[PDB]
Amino acid sequence: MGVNSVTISVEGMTCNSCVWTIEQQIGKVNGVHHIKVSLEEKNATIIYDPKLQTPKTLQEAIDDMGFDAVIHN
Amino acid sequence: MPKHEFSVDMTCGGCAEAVSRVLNKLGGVKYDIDLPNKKVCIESEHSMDTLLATLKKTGKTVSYLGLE
Ligand SMILES: [Cu+2]
């Protein structure tokens, strides 16, 4: 119990505000604790709670858009 | 044919391109994007409210703005 974390190579995100769309859609999935996205290194980092979130649930929240997300911590 | 016009907050080309993959979840849809005008112009036998809800999966200000 306590903070869990993972990295997801969002290979469809890089420009200006695909980046911002992640922080909108992730930040309202109750179990998230801290989101970070890297636009030139083309990846997405997050700290989350294990009672309320999972790496599988992160891959569902990117699938609300159209970005080429693969788990890679 | 039901050519309907919708406008969505395309602050980015990736932020826009997402509309293609969510409309492909419905599949039975025809659509064409204008990145400067911020428009997606659609025709499907599915309802305007199905299309609007599907676009709003992409996390933005989306407004239905009438007919061509
Ligand atoms: Cu972008």
Swiss-Prot record, chain A:
Residues 4-70 form the HMA domain. It comes from the Eukaryota. Widely expressed including in heart, brain, lung, muscle, kidney, pancreas, and to a lesser extent placenta. Expressed in fibroblasts, aortic smooth muscle cells, aortic endothelial cells and umbilical vein endothelial cells (at protein level). Cu(+) 1 binds at T14, C15, C18. It is found in: Golgi apparatus, trans-Golgi network membrane; Cell membrane; Melanosome membrane; Early endosome membrane. It is linked to Menkes disease: An X-linked recessive disorder of copper metabolism characterized by generalized copper deficiency. MNKD results in progressive neurodegeneration and connective-tissue disturbances: focal cerebral and cerebellar degeneration, early growth retardation, peculiar hair, hypopigmentation, cutis laxa, vascular complications and death in early childhood. The clinical features result from the dysfunction of several copper-dependent enzymes. A mild form of the disease has been described, in which cerebellar ataxia and moderate developmental delay predominate. Occipital horn syndrome: An X-linked recessive disorder of copper metabolism. Common features are unusual facial appearance, skeletal abnormalities, chronic diarrhea and genitourinary defects. The skeletal abnormalities include occipital horns, short, broad clavicles, deformed radii, ulnae and humeri, narrowing of the rib cage, undercalcified long bones with thin cortical walls and coxa valga. Belongs to the cation transport ATPase (P-type) (TC 3.A.3) family. Type IB subfamily. The nucleotide-binding domain consists of a twisted six-stranded antiparallel beta-sheet flanked by two pairs of alpha-helices, forming a hydrophobic pocket that interacts with the adenine ring of ATP. Monomer. Interacts with PDZD11. Interacts with ATOX1 and COMMD1. Interacts with TYRP1. Directly interacts with SOD3; this interaction is copper-dependent and is required for SOD3 activity. ATP-driven copper (Cu(+)) ion pump that plays an important role in intracellular copper ion homeostasis. Within a catalytic cycle, acquires Cu(+) ion from donor protein on the cytoplasmic side of the membrane and delivers it to acceptor protein on the lumenal side. The transfer of Cu(+) ion across the membrane is coupled to ATP hydrolysis and is associated with a transient phosphorylation that shifts the pump conformation from inward-facing to outward-facing state. This is Copper-transporting ATPase 1. The gene is ATP7A. The chain holds residues 5 to 77 of 1500 of the full protein.
From Swiss-Prot, chain B:
Ubiquitous. Residues 1-63 form the HMA domain. One of its GO terms (molecular function) is copper ion binding. Cu cation binds at C12, C15. One of its GO terms (cellular component) is cytosol. The keyword Ribosomal protein does not apply. The modification N6-acetyllysine is found at K60. The keyword Phosphoprotein applies. One of its GO terms (biological process) is intracellular copper ion homeostasis. This is Copper transport protein ATOX1. It comes from Homo sapiens (Human). The lineage of its organism: Eukaryota, Metazoa, Chordata, Craniata, Vertebrata. The gene is ATOX1.
